[PDB]
Amino acid sequence: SKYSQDVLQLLYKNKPNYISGQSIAESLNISRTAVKKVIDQLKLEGCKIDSVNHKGHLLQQLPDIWYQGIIDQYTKSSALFDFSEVYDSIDSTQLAAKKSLVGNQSSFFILSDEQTKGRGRFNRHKGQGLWMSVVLRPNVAFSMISKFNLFIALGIRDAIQHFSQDEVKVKWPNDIYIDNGKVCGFLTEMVANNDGIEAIICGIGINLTQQLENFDESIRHRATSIQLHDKNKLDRYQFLERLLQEIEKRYNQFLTLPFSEIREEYIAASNIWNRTLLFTENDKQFKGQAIDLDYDGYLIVRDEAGESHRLISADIDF
């Protein structure tokens, strides 16, 4: 309905208290019967609302569906994001972000329940995943894109880790794993010129509400979900809030710290050591061992032929 997310916004905003249907009616200037219709449908979409006579309604639990009205409360208090666009469907949050950033300097993120044309690095190709693009505006040289990628890696990792009993680790430079299972991929893009960066665009894809049980019985050998490693149930909104808070903390770190400061923490969180890696670049594939991540975010590799490589970026397979 026209007023669904306003009612949702009021219900969420008032937790942990009950709120009366009259209050909602007065707040939106609609009748108490119109409110009942909205709240009923809220329930039939899977919203869990407790309604007791004379006292009102209490939002107890949100379903596995993004609601604009809820996310507006997140951007309301955010010292980072100016707004957010929530979609049930879209070709790609990244495509939407790259269009919406043009002509302005606002910081925002774009969320969609499903993507019809999601693309990751090199143009590689249900409500069980998080698909989000984040637009930030750091006043830095375009060289610093590699450095941003390193920082938010730890941010995304920390958020997933908080909900995972098993340990979450980074496959440099663009992926997150829990044990053998890849749980997230992300890429960092930018709009820049010689004089600096006009925007950072960070697309993040995370296998979410996929409770042991849940997640699709496919590649249970190298793909996993956050919740196949959480005893309790995983709420998307509790996760998203933790994820945004970590993105902001790591973003400010990116602005204030050299990579030297977070480097040892990054290495302790990487799963690329002490194993033979497969490197793809263009024509050629070759095997190698990662020796070190140097002071500048460059991976130091010794290939199977003994030769040394120093790579800002890489396409790595296990």
Ligand X SMILES: O=C1N[C@H]2[C@H](CS[C@H]2CCCCCc2cn(Cc3cccc(F)c3)nn2)N1
Task: List residues near ligand X by CB under 6 A.
Answer: 92-94, 115, 118-120, 124-125, 131, 133, 185, 187, 203, 205
CA-closest candidate to residue 87, choices 127, 123, 42, 121: 127
SS3 state at 55: coil
Q: How far is the CB of 113 from ligand X (least distance, A)?
A: 12
Q: How far is the CB of 219 from ligand X (least distance, A)?
A: 11
Instruction: Copy the structure tokens of residue 220.
Output: 């249970």
Cβ(57)–Cβ(49) below 8 Å: yes
Q: How far is the CB of 51 from ligand X (least distance, A)?
A: 37
Which of residues 93 and 227 has its CB atom nearest to ligand X in the complex?
Answer: 93
Give the N- to C-terminal CA distance of the chain in Å, as an integer: 49
Which of residues 59 and 187 has its CB atom nearest to ligand X in the complex?
Answer: 187
Residue of minimal Cβ distance to ligand X = 185
Which of residues 92 and 224 has its CB atom nearest to ligand X in the complex?
Answer: 92
108-115 vs 83-90, strand pairing mode: parallel
Q: How far is the CB of 135 from ligand X (least distance, A)?
A: 12
Q: How far is the CB of 3 from ligand X (least distance, A)?
A: 30
**H runs (alpha helix) in 29-89:** 32-44, 68-77
Rounded alpha-carbon distances, angstroms, from residue 44 to 94, 106, 245, 278? 31, 36, 31, 49
Cβ(69)–Cβ(6) below 8 Å: yes
User: In this structure, what is the dihedral angle of CA atoms 244, 250, 253, 254, given to the nearest 10 degrees?
Assistant: -110
Which of residues 207 and 227 has its CB atom nearest to ligand X in the complex?
Answer: 207
Which of residues 15 and 222 has its CB atom nearest to ligand X in the complex?
Answer: 222
CA atoms within 13 Å, Cβ hemisphere of 244: 27
Q: How far is the CB of 202 from ligand X (least distance, A)?
A: 9
Cβ(242)–Cβ(250) below 8 Å: no
Single-letter residue type at 286 = F
Which of residues 39 and 201 has its CB atom nearest to ligand X in the complex?
Answer: 201
Within a 10 A sphere around the Cβ of 261, how many other Cβ atoms? 10
Which of residues 181 and 205 has its CB atom nearest to ligand X in the complex?
Answer: 205
CA-closest candidate to residue 208, choices 271, 144, 114: 114
Q: How far is the CB of 111 from ligand X (least distance, A)?
A: 9
Q: Edge-to-edge strand order for the sheet containing 277-281?
A: 308-311, 299-303, 284-293, 277-281, 315-317
Which of residues 21 and 118 has its CB atom nearest to ligand X in the complex?
Answer: 118
Which of residues 94 and 271 has its CB atom nearest to ligand X in the complex?
Answer: 94
Q: How far is the CB of 124 from ligand X (least distance, A)?
A: 4
CA-closest candidate to residue 200, choices 130, 148, 122, 243: 148
Q: How far is the CB of 10 from ligand X (least distance, A)?
A: 30
